[PDB]
From a paper:
AP sites are then processed by apurinic/apyrimidinic endonuclease 1 (APE1), which cleaves the phosphodiester DNA backbone at the 5′ end of the AP site using its endonuclease activity. Upon binding an AP site, APE1 flips the AP site out of the DNA double helix and into an extrahelical position within the compact APE1 active site. In the human APE1 substrate complex, N174 is within hydrogen bonding distance of N212 and the AP site bridging oxygen (O5) and deoxyribose sugar oxygen (O4). To assess the role of N174 during APE1 catalysis, we rationally designed four mutations of N174: N174A, N174D, N174Q, and N174K.
The APE1N174D mutant had a kobs of 0.0026 ± 0.0010 s−1, corresponding to a 330,000-fold reduction in kobs compared to APE1WT. Next, we crystallized the APE1N174D mutant protein bound to a 21-mer dsDNA oligo containing a centrally located THF AP site analog. In these crystals, the AP site has been cleaved by APE1 resulting in a product complex that diffracted to 2.10 Å resolution in the P1 space group. Within this structure, both N174D and the AP site are positioned in the active site with clear density for the cleaved DNA backbone, however there is no metal bound. We overlayed the APE1N174D mutant product complex with the APE1WT product complex and observed similar active site conformations (RMSD = 0.335 of 2321 atoms). Consistent with what we observed for the APE1N174A mutant, residue N212 in the APE1N174D mutant failed to undergo the rotameric shift observed in APE1WT following product formation. The 5′ phosphate and 3′ hydroxyl DNA termini in the APE1N174D mutant product complex are only moderately shifted compared to their positions in the APE1WT product complex. These shifts are considerably smaller than those observed in the APE1N174A mutant product complex, supporting the idea that the N174 side chain acts as a steric barrier to keep the cleaved 5′ and 3′ DNA termini within the APE1 active site. However, given that the rate of cleavage for the APE1N174D mutant is even lower than in the APE1N174A mutant, we hypothesize the charge of the N174D mutation may account for the remaining difference in cleavage rates between our mutants. We found that a larger area of the APE1N174D mutant active site surface was more negatively charged than APE1WT.
Author numbering: 43 to 318
Write the structure that this text describes.
DNA sequence: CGACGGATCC
DNA sequence: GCTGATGCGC
DNA sequence: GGATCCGTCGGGCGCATCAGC
């Protein structure tokens, strides 16, 4: 069945106005995403913080339009040291973070430009392109170790301000998070190993799924669709993109959106509204 | 990884 | 510089 | 035999390299 994201709730449960909008988007090729008119959707969306994943683009090769967004002038980029054309993350902010760091503090996992940490006054933001388990599950065991190191890095993130984890976590937590869970329990992103790791992220850090807290039984809500067999036209997809938040932030949670109409990638943009 | 084809199931 | 084959990873 | 279970195949994209010119 198709999916129409409910209208934006730009007010919290206590009637407080959204002071912060964050947009996360796996662009599957930032230079391609821009030629495909992706920055135009960002302009219309006017986010305060824009997190991008799978940039596939080093810093010296970023298109000049990216350095022309005035409401997103604070830009921070991370790419693999060896694999050019692979992975890559980005954080564009209206206001300068107090602190910007890269990696989960672990050499085995900090080589593929997958994590940017940005400390703001009231919260700590973390964008992530989590390792894929791969065709045939070749990189599953690596994903399992990444999960362990990520869980630990996040739980002890130095200080005590709430956490907003955003990005491509590369798993569909439960069966409601993908069209075909039965034929994908042995396919990357639906292995029980990965699904349990997400569960442990939630219990250990701890964190909550913004979208699922608001929409616990909303089906067909996906963020990724294979380009193959035009899976997007039939909404056969997976929710791999999320905003996970400390429970301290749930009183500030106005909404968590899925922008199913925005094109440019095999992923759709997600958006969080927060009243801080 | 969605689609498909074969195998099995009551 | 520019394109197309080839390879690799989603 | 309609419905379900499950393994195999073939394929959309982006970007890198390299050759040729």
């Amino acid at each position: 069945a198709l999916y129409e994201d409910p209208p934006d709730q730009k007010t919290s449960p206590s009637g407080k106005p959204a002071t912060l909008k964050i947009c996360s988007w796996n662009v599957d090729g930032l230079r391609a995403w821009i030629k495909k008119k992706g920055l135009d959707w960002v302009k219309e969306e006017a986010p305060d913080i824009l997190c991008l994943q799978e940039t596939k683009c080093s810093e010296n090769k970023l298109p000049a339009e990216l350095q022309e967004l005035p409401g997103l002038s604070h830009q921070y980029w991370s790419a693999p040291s060896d694999k050019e054309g692979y992975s890559g993350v980005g954080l564009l902010s209206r206001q300068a973070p107090l602190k910007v760091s890269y990696g989960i503090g672990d050499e085995e996992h900090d080589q593929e430009g997958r994590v940017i940490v940005a400390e703001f006054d009231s919260f700590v933001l973390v964008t992530a392109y989590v390792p894929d388990a791969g065709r045939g599950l070749v990189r599953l065991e690596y994903r399992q170790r990444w999960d362990e190191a990520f869980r630990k890095f996040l739980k002890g993130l130095a200080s005590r301000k709430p956490l907003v984890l955003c990005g491509d976590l590369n798993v569909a937590h439960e069966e409601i998070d993908l069209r075909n869970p039965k034929g994908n329990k042995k396919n990357a992103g639906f292995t029980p190993q990965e699904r349990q790791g997400f569960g442990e992220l939630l219990q250990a850090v701890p964190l909550a799924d913004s979208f699922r807290h608001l929409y616990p039984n909303t089906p067909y809500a996906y963020t990724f669709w294979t380009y193959m067999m035009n899976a997007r036209s039939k909404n056969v997809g997976w929710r791999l993109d999320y905003f996970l938040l400390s429970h301290s932030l749930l009183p500030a949670l106005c909404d968590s959106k899925i922008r199913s109409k925005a094109l440019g990638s095999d992923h759709c943009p997600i958006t969080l509204y927060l009243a801080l």
